[PDB]
């Protein structure tokens, strides 16, 4: 059905290309008697062509991961302008974690206006044994720093809130982590992202010789 409607929209846009190419290539002569149709069918092309990039909003362009949210209230001062900013994080418990950030005019509207963009710009994290991370690592954003140490299988998640709700639905279960410096939100996000993407698992460390045993 997906391909059905895709090529169908393509049929629409192909009749668009046809007639509008014809009209364009008739530049020569009297003006109105082609421009009327010009405007009509181009407006039609708009209505149809934008529905492709419309689709991602609700049904597809929407997987079955889970999402979580952030939000604050920016300002402009032409009079006393007020708006809303909001953040979202998608994750599937296997580790595909992604996020997104966008603005709107009211809370639920901003939550929404990201609810269909969190599913783009995806980065894929490699959770070592389905419960924890491959090693210890420090990683810093501009002025937020981060420390990741694994734990053996039974402790549990020892992290904060903004970092817990990422290491949770990435698929980790026994990480201990320390974020230090700025206690901001959107830097801890993208700090976790600049961090987890930094771990080089033994698959990676086989960047040179040596099969790295696990100690059994």
């Amino acid at each position: 059905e997906r391909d059905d409607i895709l090529l169908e929209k393509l049929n629409a846009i192909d009749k668009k290309l046809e007639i509008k190419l014809s009209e364009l290539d008739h530049t020569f002569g009297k003006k109105g008697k082609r421009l009327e149709e010009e405007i009509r069918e181009l407006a039609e092309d708009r209505n149809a062509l934008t529905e492709k990039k419309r689709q991602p909003l609700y049904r597809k362009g929407y997987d079955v991961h889970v999402i979580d949210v952030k939000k604050v209230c920016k300002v402009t001062k032409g009079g006393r302008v007020e708006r809303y900013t909001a953040l979202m994080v998608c994750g599937n418990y296997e580790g595909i974690i992604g996020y997104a950030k966008a603005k709107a005019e009211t809370g639920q509207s901003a939550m929404q206006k990201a609810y269909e963009k969190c599913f783009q710009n995806l980065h894929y994290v490699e959770r070592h044994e389905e419960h924890t991370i491959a090693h210890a690592i420090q990683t810093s954003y501009k002025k937020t720093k981060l420390y990741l140490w694994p734990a053996p299988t039974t402790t549990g998640m020892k992290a904060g809130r903004v970092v817990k709700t990422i290491l949770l639905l990435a698929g980790f279960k026994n990480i201990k982590s320390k974020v230090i410096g700025s206690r901001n939100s959107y830097n801890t996000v993208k700090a976790v992202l600049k961090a987890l993407n930094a771990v080089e698992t033994p698959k990676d460390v086989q960047e040179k010789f040596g099969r790295t045993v696990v100690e059994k």
């Binding site: 491959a134 090693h135 210890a136 690592i137 420090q138 694994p150 460390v205 960047e207 040179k208 010789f209």
Partner: protein, 128 residues
């Protein structure tokens, strides 16, 4: 530990992340030659041809392109053989890897060779 050592190691690291592939270090040393070789046969470089055994000083090291932060210690400190199991936890990736390099009476080791031979000495460098 000296500072010409720190110098050799940092010149290595900075040439690496600059992207050149073959460098030359003027003030050479035996503890530095040993360390270049140690890195080599642990994998981190490609050739380490020292030139003048005496009286002049020149090494030409040609490099692979691995991570290599490898800070070279300055303030001496002991290392027994049974203390590495906890001391090499203060490298960058505390758990996984990096080879704290130790000096012994039986030649300059790394921490694997050390904890095998059950010999000690003094720390000199790191690996990441």
């Amino acid at each position: 530990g000296r500072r010409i050592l720190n110098d050799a190691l940092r010149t290595i690291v900075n040439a690496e992340r600059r992207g050149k592939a073959s460098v030359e270090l003027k003030p050479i040393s035996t503890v530095m030659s040993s360390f270049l070789r140690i890195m080599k046969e642990k994998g981190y470089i490609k050739n380490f041809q020292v030139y003048d055994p005496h009286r002049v000083g020149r090494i030409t090291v040609d490099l692979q392109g691995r991570v290599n932060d490898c800070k070279a210690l300055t303030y001496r400190q002991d290392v027994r053989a049974k203390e590495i199991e906890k001391y090499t936890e203060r490298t960058l990736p505390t758990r996984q890897w990096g080879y704290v390099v130790i000096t012994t009476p039986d030649g300059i080791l790394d921490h694997e060779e050390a904890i095998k031979r059950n010999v000690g000495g003094q720390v000199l460098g790191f690996f990441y």
